[model samples]
Target: AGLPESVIWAVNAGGEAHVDVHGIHFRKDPLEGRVGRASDYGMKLPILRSNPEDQILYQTERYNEETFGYEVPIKEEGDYVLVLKFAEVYFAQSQQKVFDVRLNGHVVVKDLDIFDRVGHSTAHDEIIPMSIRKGKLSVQGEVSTFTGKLYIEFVKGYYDNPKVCALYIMAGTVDDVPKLQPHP
Candidate 1:
């Protein structure tokens, strides 16, 4: 079966199996890299102040490493929107869990404090618009030529380990990507 035209790839990082949400079926975490998950929060309890249907995608996460990431081979070269999902499930306060994210070895998100942005156990996302042109990846004015692979890395900080709940790669501009449900 074919997927939606906009979806390039989606992964429920640190999750046990495939997850379907927002009309996208996210695959399990990639096997090329080592990843660890926090305790699963079951399936029914909605994440506090967030979309209940999106709970499974956010409940389990990959964490507890100095640095971890996923390497995806580039199947098509074009514009893309990268959505990085996060929620401060363990940390109680800001500055307790801060990290940086890199795409294709360039820092895109720096000092990301999930709790500081939206408090604990809530949905948060960083949507970055990028493109690959002639085998070079460009994001935020930075460009690097790679060997047909997209590298997404979470760098650690002094406070805590780098973590992430999910990752989405949509084959379009930011305007064409699906929006997250509004917080109630």
Candidate 2:
């Protein structure tokens, strides 16, 4: 109902995001000011045994719109925490899905294969420490000393395309990373 103060943000990716009981609001699909763009996907399993919350994300899910980009807008400059959620339900092995993640343009993850890292239909979360600050403000017409937007993107580094079931963003630095949780 108001401005988010605790510096925590969450999103289910492919679906319309909502405020959870934890008070963190989730963002929907189709990010603005993006490069490659993103899409949504959803799947139902009367079959697998995994985190129930993870099911909704893949259902009507959203993923890196293939190739160029994906981003979340930021207004403040500080150290932040990024958490990515994954569930390997569709694949039988690990090497099937491999990808990379870049924060503000720096590659943080290289050749990340979710199934190889996490088991099938298992809830997997990757926590990243990030910093957002003012970039170069040249030719002073309307630019400010502080950076206005921070971008988080996924690039396919290996087999299969990059996909994310959900994500979380917070204002604090890596010191608070231990506190980040899985989707739902």
Candidate 3:
């Protein structure tokens, strides 16, 4: 495996990030599944992991330095779901845990941790909305769980066009997201 001559964008997950492009998905979670728990999706892929228990932070650690936290190559444009499965550890006072999912650094949604408030220790089902070419996709996240281990399964499902470009999945880094501005 080598680097591509032309790069549309760069990603930084802050830790280990494994992106799987099984294929471009046009439909949303048409297939119901669970979050945090890897076995629920029926997807043959590794799950997200972390150290330091509830203090599970990946800001600068080696295991915390990933090129793409959750990334996939896109080749078309359509409404897509940025999914993620992960176990939680901690939160504000540890009352209830959830993932503050930030897309392109914008508040796409919060409390995606799922397990803490839901019951399952997994999280998925569109962490953010992905718009290719015209949009620079970013899947940055931070988990606060006060329990056992956790995993994050991130994927982008959209109607592919092959003619354009395949999308990429990755975690957000310090400089991944930019200041709010109109899409030029």
Question: What is candidate 3's lDDT per residue for 40-148, written digit by digit as tens?
Answer: 2212222232222211211211111111123234454333333332333223233343334343335455434334333322222233434333333323332232122
- Please say which candidate is ahead in TM-score: 2 or 3: 2
- Each model's C-alpha lDDT? 0.77, 0.59, 0.27
Best by lDDT: 1
- Model 1 pairs whose backbones collide: none
Alpha-carbon error at 160 in model 3, in Å?
36
**Tens-digit lDDT track of model 1 for 124-178:** 8899999888868889998888678888889977987888888888887877765
Candidate 1's displacement at residue 24, Å, is 0.1
lDDT of 2 at 70: 49
* Model 2 regions lying over 4 Å from their true place: 1-4, 32-42, 46-55, 58-60, 133-146, 175-184
lDDT of 3 at 50: 23
Better of 1 and 2 by TM-score: 1
Better model by TM-score: candidate 1 vs candidate 3? 1
Model 3, position 97: C-alpha lDDT score: 36
